């Protein structure tokens, strides 16, 4: 609740969070078979929290499960889909019983008239409805695992304008809340899939805000934004890519309190 802020030490905190951030083994992402299932050579899932694809040949996709015990909120953070990936993306989404998708990074159907099919993973994707607001756009989507012939609906929230290492303060929250209100975050359903370009900077900022906002409800002013992020950064390396972004989560959360 206190501005650092005249001190100007915002980077010093980031350097601490970056430095004191635990690093874990990444054996499986590293494998020559999995060289091209990664978009980014530097960003990779921790071997312990990674999502495993059910398809027997290769169970690897670049996603990591965040579980936050106390807050009760679980997210799945993944790089955006590559050409290869699109099938895997929806595979996981279907495997983890997810009922919400969060794109913050400027693989779905543009027209209702035209369905989408992935031979690779044997899933279909049809648009159902669309909603454009200026800040963010929402689609109502339908997934059928063709083999099952069982259809389960999915909600896609696209934060249209978040710069690659940029923010994000009101629109962010409206958007966060919109996602909350839809019930995609609710624990009845599997994890909400959150994806930035590699699923760290924007993803972290997004998930950071929402979790801490949950803490104030549950707990009062006890919460520390660090400690939570360090803890969060245990499941997926490199969450929050800038000091400006960190400051922003701190900020959003403060504003979100009211």
């Amino acid at each position: 609740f206190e501005q650092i802020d005249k001190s100007g030490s915002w980077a010093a905190i980031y350097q601490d969070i970056r430095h004191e951030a635990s690093d874990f083994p990444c054996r499986v992402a590293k494998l020559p078979k999995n060289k091209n299932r990664n978009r980014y050579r530097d960003v990779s899932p921790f071997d312990h929290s990674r999502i495993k694809l059910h398809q027997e040949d290769n169970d690897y996709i670049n996603a990591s499960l965040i579980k936050m015990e106390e807050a009760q909120r679980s997210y799945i953070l993944t790089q955006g889909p590559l050409p290869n990936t699109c099938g895997h993306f929806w595979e996981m989404v279907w495997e983890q019983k997810s009922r919400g998708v969060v794109m913050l990074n400027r693989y779905w159907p543009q027209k209702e008239e035209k369905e989408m099919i992935f031979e690779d993973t044997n899933l279909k994707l049809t648009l159902i409805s669309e909603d454009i607001k200026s800040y963010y756009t929402v689609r109502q989507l339908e997934l059928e695992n063709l083999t099952t012939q069982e259809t389960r609906e999915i909600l896609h929230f696209h934060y249209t304008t978040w710069p690659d290492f940029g923010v994000p303060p009101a629109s962010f929250l409206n958007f966060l809340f919109k996602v909350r209100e839809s019930g995609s975050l609710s624990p009845e359903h599997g994890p909400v899939v959150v994806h930035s370009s590699a699923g760290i900077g924007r993803s972290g900022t997004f998930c950071l805000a929402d979790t801490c906002l949950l803490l104030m409800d549950k707990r009062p002013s006890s919460v520390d934004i660090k400690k939570v992020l360090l803890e969060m950064r245990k499941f997926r390396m490199g969450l929050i890519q800038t000091a400006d972004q960190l400051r922003f989560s701190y900020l959003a959360v403060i504003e979100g309190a009211k």
């Binding site: 050579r41 370009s197 900077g201 890519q241």
Partner: peptide, 6 residues
Amino acid sequence: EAQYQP
């Protein structure tokens, strides 16, 4: 194969 980072 690019790096997101910096």
